[PDB]
Amino acid sequence: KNIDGYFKIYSKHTPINLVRDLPQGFSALEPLVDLPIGINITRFQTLL
Amino acid sequence: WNSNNLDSKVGGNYNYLYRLFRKSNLKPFERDISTEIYQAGSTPCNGVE
Glycosylation annotated at which residues (chain A)? Predict the structure, then answer.
């Protein structure tokens, strides 16, 4: 997320045995650290 | 504060400019460093002034 230039990262690990059709289970996401840069972001791209 | 010897040059000042005619209004908490030409009706200039 990007609110007032602050970068929020919510990461969480959970075990699961499935390839598709994600189950209806519930699990929260907790943050780890705040990154207050203060810039604007409009595009993104993942690395493989 | 007022500057009498910091930015007051004899040969004018060309490093500082202000937007006056562009239609794009700068919203708060934003920044735009695009240097283009204002378009009046037809003939979009955008640098072909």
Answer: 40
Nearest C-alpha of chain A: how many angstroms from B4? Answer: 33
Question: Comparing C-alpha atoms, which of A11, A39, A45, A4 is closest to residue A27?
Answer: A11
Separation between Cα atoms, residue B17 and residue B32, nearest integer Å: 13
* Residue of chain A with shortest Cα separation from B28: A4
A40 contacts A3 by C-beta, under 8 angstroms? no
Resolution in A for the shown PDB structure? 4.8
State the DSSP string of A1-25.
-EETTEEEEEE-------SSS--S-
- Say which experimental method was used: cryo-EM
